[PDB]
Amino acid sequence: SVNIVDYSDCFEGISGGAIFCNTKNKEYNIYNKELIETRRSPCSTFKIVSTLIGLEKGVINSKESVMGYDGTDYPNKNWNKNLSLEEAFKESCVWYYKKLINKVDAKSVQNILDDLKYGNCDISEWEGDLKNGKGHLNGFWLESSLQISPKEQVQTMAKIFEGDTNFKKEHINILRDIMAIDVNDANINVYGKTGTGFDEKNKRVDAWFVGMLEREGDTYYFAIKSDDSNKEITGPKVKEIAINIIKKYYS
Numbered sequence: 001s002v003n004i005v006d007y008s009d010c011f012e013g014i015s016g017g018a019i020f021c022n023t024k025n026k027e028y029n030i031y032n033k034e035l036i037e038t039r040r041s042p043c044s045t046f047k048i049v050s051t052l053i054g055l056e057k058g059v060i061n062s063k064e065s066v067m068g069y070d071g072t073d074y075p076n077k078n079w080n081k082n083l084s085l086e087e088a089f090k091e092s093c094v095w096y097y098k099k100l101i102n103k104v105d106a107k108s109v110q111n112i113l114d115d116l117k118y119g120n121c122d123i124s125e126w127e128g129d130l131k132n133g134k135g136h137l138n139g140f141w142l143e144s145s146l147q148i149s150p151k152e153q154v155q156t157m158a159k160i161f162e163g164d165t166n167f168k169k170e171h172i173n174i175l176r177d178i179m180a181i182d183v184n185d186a187n188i189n190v191y192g193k194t195g196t197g198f199d200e201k202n203k204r205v206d207a208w209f210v211g212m213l214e215r216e217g218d219t220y221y222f223a224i225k226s227d228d229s230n231k232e233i234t235g236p237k238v239k240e241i242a243i244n245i246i247k248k249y250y251s
Ligand SMILES: *C(=O)N1C[C@H](NOS(=O)(=O)O)CC[C@H]1C(N)=O
Pocket: 043, 044, 045, 091, 092, 094, 142, 143, 194, 195, 196, 197, 234, 235, 236
């Protein structure tokens, strides 16, 4: 079942690991086991769960749902509008997801994380890593108190998308909808979300791509993670590595 594998050829000399799990036939493919078991901040990958929280609590209702943009100026052009759930997810729009999560009481979030077994489920630093100076552009899921391992990410993904949580199927399908990506291969369906952060304590990136793939009957849940010391390594870069792994070993 648990197969140690070597995907270093796809990592282009970047430090990281990967885990792919097929729950039907229990095949667990692990590259860099120590890293895959290490908890780190989820960064923007948490938007997968925060979207479901918002849908479940009725803060948002569909992929068109808006959060009432108030005119605040942001450097990313596409944050400066009353964007829908679908575009806020794809743009990783921090103000949208901060306003969303701050409409939900802390006990509801704690119980949902507990139910999902979401890493350390530690939301004690609700406001986030305020020492970085970024103020309200912060939260417990952004290089702060909440931490989860790549293995636990995969377990959470599988629980959600195999229908094993109490989240509504309608809401699960919205997530599938907005997480779908185009890999120029119609023979596989890939879904995911990136994450980018810098671990200031250890001087290492937290660069993520987490999601799942479907091809000809089988579904693999996956998490690819870099902990490189090179600050240029981002979520988008690790998503490229993930796509190379998928095209090479999961075709
Ligand atoms: C989430 O990881 N973040 C928000 C934004 N999106 O990054 S992503 O492209 O990897 O999704 C960039 C910064 C980052 C953050 N912690 O602010």
